[PDB]
Design a protein around this ligand. Sequence first.
Ligand SMILES: [Mg+2]
Ligand SMILES: [Mg+2]
Ligand SMILES: [Mg+2]
Ligand SMILES: [Mg+2]
Ligand SMILES: [Mg+2]
Ligand SMILES: [Mg+2]
Ligand SMILES: [Mg+2]
Ligand SMILES: [Mg+2]
Ligand SMILES: [Mg+2]
Ligand SMILES: [Mg+2]
Ligand SMILES: [Mg+2]
Ligand SMILES: [Mg+2]
Ligand SMILES: [Mg+2]
Ligand SMILES: [Mg+2]
Ligand SMILES: [Mg+2]
Ligand SMILES: [Mg+2]
Ligand SMILES: [Mg+2]
Ligand SMILES: [Mg+2]
Lengths: 137, 170, 178, 244
Amino acid sequence: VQSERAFQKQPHIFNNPKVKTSKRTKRWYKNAGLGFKTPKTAIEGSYIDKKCPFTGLVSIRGKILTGTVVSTKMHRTIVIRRAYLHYIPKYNRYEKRHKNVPVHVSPAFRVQVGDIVTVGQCRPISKTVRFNVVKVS
Amino acid sequence: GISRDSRHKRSATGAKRAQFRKKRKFELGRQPANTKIGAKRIHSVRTRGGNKKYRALRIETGNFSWASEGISKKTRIAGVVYHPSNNELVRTNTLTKAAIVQIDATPFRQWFEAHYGQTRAASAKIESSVESQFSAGRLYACISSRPGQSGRCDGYILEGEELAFYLRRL
Amino acid sequence: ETIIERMPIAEALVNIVLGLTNDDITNFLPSILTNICQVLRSKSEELRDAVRVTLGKISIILGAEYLVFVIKELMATLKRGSQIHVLSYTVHYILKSMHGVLKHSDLDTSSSMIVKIIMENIFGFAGEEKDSENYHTKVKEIKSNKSYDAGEILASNISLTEFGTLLSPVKALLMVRI
Amino acid sequence: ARGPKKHLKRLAAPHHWLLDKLSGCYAPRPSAGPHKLRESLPLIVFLRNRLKYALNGREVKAILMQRHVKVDGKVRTDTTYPAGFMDVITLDATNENFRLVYDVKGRFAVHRITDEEASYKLGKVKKVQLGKKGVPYVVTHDGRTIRYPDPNIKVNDTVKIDLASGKITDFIKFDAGKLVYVTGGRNLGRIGTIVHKERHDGGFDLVHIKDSLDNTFVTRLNNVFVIGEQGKPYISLPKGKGIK
RNA sequence: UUUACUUUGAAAAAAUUAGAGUGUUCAAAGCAGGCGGCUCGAAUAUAUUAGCAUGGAAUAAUAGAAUAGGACGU
RNA sequence: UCUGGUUGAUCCUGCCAGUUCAUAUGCUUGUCUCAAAGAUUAAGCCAUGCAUGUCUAAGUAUAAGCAAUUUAUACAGUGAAACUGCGAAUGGCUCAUUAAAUCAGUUAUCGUUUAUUUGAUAGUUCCUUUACUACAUGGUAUAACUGUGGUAAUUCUAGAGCUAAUACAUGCUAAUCUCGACCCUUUGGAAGAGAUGUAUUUAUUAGAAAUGUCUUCGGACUCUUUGAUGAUUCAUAAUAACUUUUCGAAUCGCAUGGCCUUGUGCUGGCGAUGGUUCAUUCAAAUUUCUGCCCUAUCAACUUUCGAUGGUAGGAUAGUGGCCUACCAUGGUUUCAACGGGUAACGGGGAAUAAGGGUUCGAUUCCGGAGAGGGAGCCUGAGAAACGGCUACCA
Ligand SMILES: [Mg+2]
Ligand SMILES: [Mg+2]
Ligand SMILES: [Mg+2]
Ligand SMILES: [Mg+2]
Ligand SMILES: [Mg+2]
Ligand SMILES: [Mg+2]
Ligand SMILES: [Mg+2]
Ligand SMILES: [Mg+2]
Ligand SMILES: [Mg+2]
Ligand SMILES: [Mg+2]
Ligand SMILES: [Mg+2]
Ligand SMILES: [Mg+2]
Ligand SMILES: [Mg+2]
Ligand SMILES: [Mg+2]
Ligand SMILES: [Mg+2]
Ligand SMILES: [Mg+2]
Ligand SMILES: [Mg+2]
Ligand SMILES: [Mg+2]
């Protein structure tokens, strides 16, 4: 959890050393809404992720999309592939098209290449990421 | 000359984009204020709208908080000991947010002695590392303010796991 | 998860409201009855049966003078597809439930609405959908036809002077090829 | 552009004003005010194109600078002042009181009201929130902030505002069976009773409305305005009673 | 079961297009109110795709602890 | 697309001959209504004139201005000049650049600024030099103006002397609310115990079987005590400090009412302009999904000099590789990436057609961009402005 040059912490969550009520450091979390269950690995985890939808400073609002994970080779973000049929009226026929969406995945989730994820829209996280994994399947 | 537009960058595919338009004032940046320890030098900046920012060009004091004791005292900043982004900021003693600095322990020591009557006993007990620092005369603190934005060099005294982490990193 | 358990709360609301002053009754009853009928939009058959029993009990508590309001509310909320079949199944259930409480000529005011539902579900488009072999569904409202029983309930209550309301759609049907 | 626009082409003007296309090149651009640009009737359009008391803009200015026109009980001298839905316009010299309500065509109707009805208006609650020092307040559809509201008042409810004091006299909850007026969309101007509010989290809520002729239609919740209980509105309604 | 598909409903500025009324002297046009309550008057419509709500029994994909099994040890 | 020929007479396949719009141009051209006006891919170059200023009773007049007067006693009618304020960021023009860019429809801001409009909103009583302006502070100050001047020349200005403010800069003046013993039993009195703005930065905290007794039959006796969203570290509140630190009316017109212990005493009407924060409105910046012509004889591209992502900081109004430091090695692509061409601004639309299609859209509305070419800025709520400024190229 502390593999960075700076100390990782949830901002403004204070763990009082003088009191020492509980061994576990105080952990803030929220439920993201829209019927998405907050996983217990987020509630009882130790990870620090400012871009997590359950324990970071990001909210889910906007479009809710679904896709298939096609890449997981970068740290805490994946690439999903969304496929659709585009209609050509001249030939009165369809053609397969796709797009790649880069998504942020919180370390409360485990995703492999091939599984289906539901992602929710959040504020721009990076140059290309505007979505956050809210459910894996 | 600083701009924050994203049009000058390459597309996510790697394509080189062409110039859509000339640079706009609503997407500008300004020169950094490399705040340094010394006599207070602050100049205002007129920002978007009528709003104003404060540029700390130089600063040697700050309001630092002892969170366990729930207090704040104004204190002199001795120097920057560690910075997690760039070591040249430590080399040049540049004050920014998240910098680890050393502060004079005197006002906190005076408050502690006045409040607990000690140099009751259970409440007076504090961490061993913080007390060792008090013996040294300087306390490790983290700057929580943005000096180049608000003109203030506020911060707090390192304690617990954060203090252990930064003692290791030093 | 708890919707079926809470539906009888609507029956409690009708009782306390009916004790209020008449102006308050007119101000609270339409909201309560309307809200129940919207749950019939649900795609859950078990929930739709839970709604149906609460509507039956409320119908006994109320009189036949409120029957016209309920039926017109029911026709407004159920309009397309399987909802048409739910409408006639629920209309019969209310009539079946109110069989003891109903007095002679209580259904005269709502006689015209009932026969339109009855005829549409025997000879109308709804009736054909019940007889269609291509129509594979497990919904009981649609596989079951209660129009015949509703016709018997109606004929037991209608005043003989209004009995031409039943015969007129029959005559119109008989003029066309059958 | 490099800043806010100050003109309005006649073709780009709100259609419901019924401006002649050949009269000129520009329409009166409503000024900032209680109502949005597209949802407002500037006083010039009302005084000249609806009431015909003025033959042109200069006579509208002459009328306004005599302080003859009151909007919600206060004198307005701005020619493009944006009067809107549920606004009361008073002309004392003519002994006239008007309430701005759309007709079934979707256009603001010239609806004359009595001096007793001219004393209040209806405001849809757009927001309920705590202000500084923990004082609650309600924001209505016409931009009125009203402090110390009744705790039962919620968003989408309607409040009855006394114009002389600007205080809430009564309120109506948004609930099934309430009488509602459609203030947007293609059903703008129709009146009916709420049947069901279809809720979608993170999306737009929808309301089913049944008219007196038993016709049903669906509208977004943003376009719905509670005006009373069925069979008893709180305001006099225009001719047609919002039918068809 | 889900999707595709299909039905209905919102949405898709105005002008332009189609359509209704109206002796601009006719016409191209422009235009919304008349009589002293009259049940009088543009009634209006139009848009492939994408997103939103909604009714569907076929068709094409997609799913099932579907019609499964029951012997040993110290 | 049809018509007539090629045979002694037919059918099929071929040959021959005839069969609106756009540009340029020729001749003619009386009357009514109506209406437009591009083009050398030359977004090539421009003489001259005009196209942006603005004053109410209500910011500032001893103009040595004009005119009045019961012929003036601080001023007072009207008012050039100048200061102050606001606007000049709208409008109008053009289509050069631009190929997921603009644009169209559809989203988001729980990711930010917003002059103005509309609605709300700020008694902090006291706290030692009271050695005390609030019946009201300064030049830490000037323009116009007067006068002395430089230059061939410009909406060039220097030295000297004056004088205002809603300019600039300073700075003040016996309250209210909780309980309340005691009396008294209400229209109560009050010994006393307590409490006390905003703005800025940070840290911390909150924000979740009374089913009885009496009573006059009413009612009283004990307890409750934030709200919202699908969702928040939200609204709001509290504690401790902090600040080259804010604000908390030294402003203006009209008028002369009310109390008296008769003092130019106290009080007091209808307005203007300002001012803190919130809301609203006019907006702005970003933003989600889908959708573009030709080219594969362009198959790999991006990443050394940010390309994809992580952590932290800096900058921004604010999210974000937007930039920096340190880390990983990612990102796109035969479902056509990347590169090339475009006589490529996009759309609403126009033409044609029986339908499918195909072409046109600089051009009355909307959106974008530009002001000879690159680049950078001041002021301001708002401009990377060009009928604003600074450089370089021509
Ligand atoms: Mg412009
Ligand atoms: Mg609608
Ligand atoms: Mg003649
Ligand atoms: Mg003024
Ligand atoms: Mg290209
Ligand atoms: Mg103004
Ligand atoms: Mg205001
Ligand atoms: Mg907060
Ligand atoms: Mg950062
Ligand atoms: Mg770098
Ligand atoms: Mg071009
Ligand atoms: Mg244009
Ligand atoms: Mg420009
Ligand atoms: Mg030129
Ligand atoms: Mg300005
Ligand atoms: Mg420029
Ligand atoms: Mg020019
Ligand atoms: Mg210009």
